[PDB]
């Protein structure tokens, strides 16, 4: 270890800490919503507090910290996210004890602020890690060694989610009042709807891990051996602006896909919603950095390598239109209730003569699977009178939806193979964004160019892309569920070809536009260099 390797190890530990904190905040939020008795809008506000804290300071921290003691500011940020992790768990310590307390047959209050600001403090915590850290790495490393270091950092950052889901599953089974009550008196199970796990333990572990990872930065040297004018010079660079729009489109497609991969798998292939995926992603990230380092690519070479990986990723993505299994046959949604005549649409379908009594509820969704392979909406709509036996509408029934044929279970196995290959190719070009966006801009603007881009990716691709992906997804919903308060609820079944066409088409053209921007940017750097 000759100075820079110590910084590389400490920044690796900070990468583990920040990804661990993200996974912990995502996983413990159900227990937080149950314990603090807060609504969905408030808990969404607490979730978005990290974005609110991060985005408003990332550009200014990246600009002003590039001239200061960069490892000292990274250690200050790790200390800050540690204090936020402790402050998130501090509501538990001084609130007191937690207190908690249809066959359908055919008939013939202010404590969340300590979470909120704490999560907001975590938003200020992760802020100096990517721009100042990566500028410190690639300013002082050997010529070509920085891509290998970033690939190693992104590979070892995957230890963080492993610890996160492991400790979340470990501390969810524990009661929230562990160490305070006699556990024999606790009657409820983790399967109970009133169960609250030890969510505070997650934040205490993450906070003290961030405080431990803050320690080695204060022992590192500064060197191993205007805002508006600089922001104008950044935003008038055409290569930079085209690269930021390009990677915004690509990462927007990534996030909008990965948010609803499991919903698409559930609706298209019928399977229920990272055991092998995480080593594949880590090996792909390290191998992409190693390819960049060993082949000694220049700026144009790194651009062609990233372009080729994303061309190959879309080339594998375009097979998704050919492995589409057939639509579900659900009585009363795609056909009539008797299954003899297809319907014109799914909006207010008429009832059939097999269940003309109908002392049921059409809004209630309890799917049942018949012997003919046709799922029904409810057993009460299915004509079943005893429990299910003597079902009237089966005449030309187990609980749950019908499992589909093995013919598209084979297509599902093809689909998860193409997902594995696609995630390998997408992780193969992860380093190239930072390498290109360093080499494009001026050398004293490396951090700010890494800051503002990190603002554009997390805002317009991190926040907005799941919103508009979900907006285009929800227009394919067939059976809508009415909420208890009558507000915007959730969807239960989707028109599978329509939902698939919208999802894969939106991802596909959002990748095609990025490929066009690749070709223009390759021509632009070939003309300029």
């Amino acid at each position: 270890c000759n100075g820079l390797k110590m910084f590389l190890a400490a920044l690796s530990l900070s990468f583990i800490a920040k990804t661990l904190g993200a996974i912990i905040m995502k996983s413990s939020i159900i227990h937080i919503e149950r314990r603090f008795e807060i609504s969905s809008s408030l808990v969404g506000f607490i979730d978005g507090s990290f974005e609110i804290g991060n985005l408003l300071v990332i550009v200014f921290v990246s600009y002003f910290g590039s001239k200061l003691h960069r490892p000292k500011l990274i250690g200050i940020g790790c200390f800050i996210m540690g204090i936020g992790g402790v402050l998130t768990a501090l509501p538990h310590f001084f609130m007191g004890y937690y207190r908690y307390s249809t066959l359908s047959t055919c008939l013939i209050s202010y404590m969340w602020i300590y979470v909120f600001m704490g999560n907001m403090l975590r938003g200020i915590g992760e802020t100096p890690i990517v721009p100042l850290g990566l500028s410190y790495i690639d300013d002082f490393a050997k010529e070509g060694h920085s891509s290998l270091y970033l690939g190693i950092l992104n590979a070892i950052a995957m230890i963080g989610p492993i610890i996160g889901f492991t400790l979340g599953s470990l501390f969810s089974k524990m009661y929230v009042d562990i160490g305070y009550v006699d556990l024999s008196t606790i009657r409820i199970t983790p399967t109970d709807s009133r169960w609250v796990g030890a969510w505070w333990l997650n934040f205490l572990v993450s906070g003290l891990f961030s405080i431990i990872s803050s320690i080695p930065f204060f022992f590192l040297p500064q060197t191993p051996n205007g805002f508006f004018q600089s922001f104008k010079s950044i935003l008038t660079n055409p290569l930079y602006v085209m690269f930021v729009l390009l990677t915004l489109l690509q990462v927007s497609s990534y996030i909008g896909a990965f948010t609803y991969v499991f919903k698409y798998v559930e609706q298209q292939y019928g399977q229920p919603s990272g055991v092998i995926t995480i080593p594949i992603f880590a090996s792909g990230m390290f191998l992409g950095g190693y390819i960049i380092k060993k082949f000694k690519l220049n700026t144009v070479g790194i651009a062609k390598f990233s372009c080729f990986t994303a061309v190959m990723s879309l080339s594998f993505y375009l097979l998704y239109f050919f492995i589409l299994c057939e639509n579900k046959s659900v009585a009363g949604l795609t056909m009539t209730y008797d299954g003899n005549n297809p319907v014109t649409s799914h909006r207010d379908v008429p009832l059939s003569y097999c269940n003309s009594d109908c002392n049921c509820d059409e809004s209630q969704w309890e799917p049942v699977c018949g012997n003919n392979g046709i799922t029904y909406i409810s057993p009460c709509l299915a004509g079943c009178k005893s429990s299910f036996y003597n079902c009237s509408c089966l005449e030309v029934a187990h609980l749950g939806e019908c499992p589909r044929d093995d013919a598209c279970t084979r297509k599902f196995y093809f689909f998860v193979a193409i997902q594995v290959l696609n995630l390998f190719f997408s992780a193969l070009g992860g380093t190239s964004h930072v390498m290109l966006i360093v080499k494009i801009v001026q050398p004293e603007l490396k951090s700010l160019a890494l800051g503002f881009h990190s603002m554009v990716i997390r805002a317009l691709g991190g926040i907005l892309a799941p919103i508009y992906f979900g907006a285009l997804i929800d227009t394919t919903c067939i059976k809508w569920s009415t909420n208890n308060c009558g507000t915007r609820g959730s969807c239960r079944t989707y028109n599978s070809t329509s939902f698939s066409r919208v999802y894969l088409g939106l991802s596909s053209m959002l990748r095609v536009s990025s490929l066009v921007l690749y070709i223009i940017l390759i021509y632009a750097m070939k003309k300029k260099y």
């Binding site: 001084f94 609130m95 004890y97 207190r99 209050s109 305070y180």
Partner: protein
């Protein structure tokens, strides 16, 4: 905060008759309880600790049990570092030993005063 632990003392327990009224005060000494929720529990004869009432840090939000709802009134005074429980229109089923509870770090309970209520 050069202190050891929070000691809670209750006062105002006494005999009441019919649907009368009473006021139980809980004073805290030790760590500052200014950030913490302070609760009121009861102990019936032959029964475990029933939860009665709660107050927030600054008195913004009050949680009450469904056993006594609208008859009881919890309150806080952080300048003198005290909580109060006003009890009105009492029943003989309210005859219990009333404890005060705080959790500044560690769960801390009071000694409890007899709030025996006559029947008539």
């Amino acid at each position: 905060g050069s202190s050891s632990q929070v000691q809670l003392v209750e006062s105002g327990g006494g005999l009441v008759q019919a649907g009368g009224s009473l006021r139980l005060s809980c004073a805290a000494s030790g760590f500052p309880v200014n950030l913490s929720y302070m609760h009121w529990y009861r102990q019936a004869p032959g029964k475990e600790r029933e939860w009665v009432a709660a107050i927030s840090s600054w008195g913004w939000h009050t949680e009450y049990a469904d056993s006594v709802k609208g008859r009881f009134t919890i309150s806080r005074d952080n300048a003198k570092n005290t909580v109060y429980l006003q009890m009105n229109s009492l029943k003989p089923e309210d005859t219990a030993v009333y404890y005060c509870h705080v959790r500044v770090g560690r769960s801390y309970f009071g000694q409890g005063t007899q709030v025996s209520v006559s029947a008539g």
